[PDB]
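User: quick one
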Amino acid sequence: YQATYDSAKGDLAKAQAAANIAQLTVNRYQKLLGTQYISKQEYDQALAD
Amino acid sequence: KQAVVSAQSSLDAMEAGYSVGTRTIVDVLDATTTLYNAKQELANARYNY
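Assistant: Done. Structure below.
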């Protein structure tokens, strides 16, 4: 239970990592919408992430 | 005049396309170069006027 316990902590850190990546793609695909920079398409790709 | 304006906002749209990387720095120097060309077309054509 210690091994599955800290293993669950490690995969928790993995979900924090991928969620951090997806969150930063949301922000820096979010601050430039409606322009030539980023459209709604890859924005909603980042929201699916 | 329309070539200077459209080359200016098109230059800035090449700054957009290079900021996203869809076009290289070559097109930046082409809209830049062609922009200065249209500058000498308009100003030098004021001289020819």
